[PDB]
Amino acid sequence: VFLGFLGAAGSTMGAASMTLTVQARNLLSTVWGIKQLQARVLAVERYLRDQQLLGIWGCSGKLICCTNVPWNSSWSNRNLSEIWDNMTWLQWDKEISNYTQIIYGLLEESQNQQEKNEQDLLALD
Amino acid sequence: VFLGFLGAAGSTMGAASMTLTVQARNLLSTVWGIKQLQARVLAVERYLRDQQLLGIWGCSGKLICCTNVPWNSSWSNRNLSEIWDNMTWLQWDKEISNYTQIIYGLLEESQNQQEKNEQDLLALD
Amino acid sequence: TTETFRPSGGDMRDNWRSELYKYKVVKIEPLGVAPTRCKRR
């Protein structure tokens, strides 16, 4: 599955959003028989932790997932052309690295929990 | 959970599609402490790789999942009675084994990616 | 005015270093956040 892996790394965020399955397929798989086994276990744990997050936001089973959390201009003020047409994901990740623990909290600690309780309350009616 | 496991293996594909949870529950769980541990890790990795595919097609969390990929008569020309009422899954798997890497590509590389972008574009309206 | 160079035995992390100098190991961070106009239903 090492075909096209990270090929879009230098591409803009828009162009690089059409290759998400290429990278996704490359995330998941005697002292020599222990250290490499630990690496395999670590890879599994890392995969599942990201899957656990995606699930905590209602983004389970999705590579592109939208929510009800507004974008705060204090995180980034760039336009949509300066993000998806004139910037790469590496540059964006560097720009937004100070806010990823805030956004994730809003994804988990505000939305989805409210959405799940609201769905629970709409289903009783 | 080893109750009914593969009992439907000799049954027709239709009859054998009502026992999917029976097999699904049996897929997931000092040199002697390493080799068997590697087997356990391997089983986990195999499980997750199939789960990773099911997710790449929008079939996550489903045992029976439908898509928008048409069936090509070049893959099989048999009718629906000759597949679900007069054939087993072992015979079908042997018949279709030359096409599984084409169908999966259509499931990943054509549909779902288009579906996810279309949903992304319908949600902005 | 002058410089003098001598052979050095170094260490063994010099023979292999001369082959591995062009390789770097990185960890993949597949999960990203970005603004779009897409709102959840």
Partner: antibody, heavy 124, light 108 residues
């Protein structure tokens, strides 16, 4: 520099079919959504259909929803409209236009940015 | 359809307002009300988009505004070349999309 040219117009009997085709140049065709808008000889403008930039999402007015098909070929830079079961109420100049929607990764385009000159469709 | 009066007229060098009245589901719900200028015999040209924005190449004499469920086009400094049929349109959701008003034939 942007030019849109409609062709495929003409006189068709009621109940017949007509396919319109809008050629475009001066911009990247695949980067913009396209719409068809019609104007009856004595009326104002009416929106008819909308297709997204990738040609996968199509929208119609109810009066044509089961009769017209909007399609794109992004390699040929060609937009087309297949008009089936033409009614007398469909006589109009049909304009193709650039705009009407955009990708979630693009700024909003809920307007018609560029217009062609229009094909005349007569039903009678 | 949107409500817009016919036969609005001004005078050279003066200001005229073309008022397009809609409902609470379209002009009053989204800030996407465009104005078009169609000379007879020609296709319409885009003059205003969103509420107050102009395409590049369009003179700043064409100023859009919106209040409540009513949108308007103000043309300040009418020219002989401004005689045209003006149209309003608004985005009105996903079940329907663009609702146009009747044309206003503006003379000078």
């Amino acid at each position: 520099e942007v030019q849109l040219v409609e062709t495929g117009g003409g006189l068709v009997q009621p109940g017949g079919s007509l396919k319109l085709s809008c050629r475009a140049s001066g911009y990247t065709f695949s980067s913009f959504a396209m719409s068809w808008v019609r104007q009856a000889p004595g009326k104002g403008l009416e929106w008819v259909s909308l297709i997204n930039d990738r040609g996968g999402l199509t929208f119609y007015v109810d009066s044509v929803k089961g009769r017209f098909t909007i399609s794109r070929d992004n390699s040929k830079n060609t937009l087309s409209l297949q008009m089936h079961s033409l009614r007398d109420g469909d006589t109009a100049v049909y304009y193709c236009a650039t705009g009407g929607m955009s990708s979630a990764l693009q700024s909003s385009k809920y307007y018609f940015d560029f217009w062609g000159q229009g094909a005349l469709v007569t039903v009678s | 359809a949107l409500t817009q009066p016919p036969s609005v007229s001004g005078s050279p060098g003066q200001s005229v307002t073309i008022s397009c009245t809609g409902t609470s589901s379209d002009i009053g719900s989204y800030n996407y009300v465009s104005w078009y200028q169609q000379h007879p015999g020609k296709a319409p040209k885009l003059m205003i988009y969103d509420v107050t924005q102009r395409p590049s190449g369009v003179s700043d004499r064409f100023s859009g505004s919106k209040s409540g469920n009513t949108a308007s086009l103000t043309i300040s400094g009418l020219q002989a070349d401004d005689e045209a049929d003006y149209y309003c349109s608004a985005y009105a959701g996903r079940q329907t999309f663009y609702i146009f008003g009747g044309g206003t034939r503006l003379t000078v």
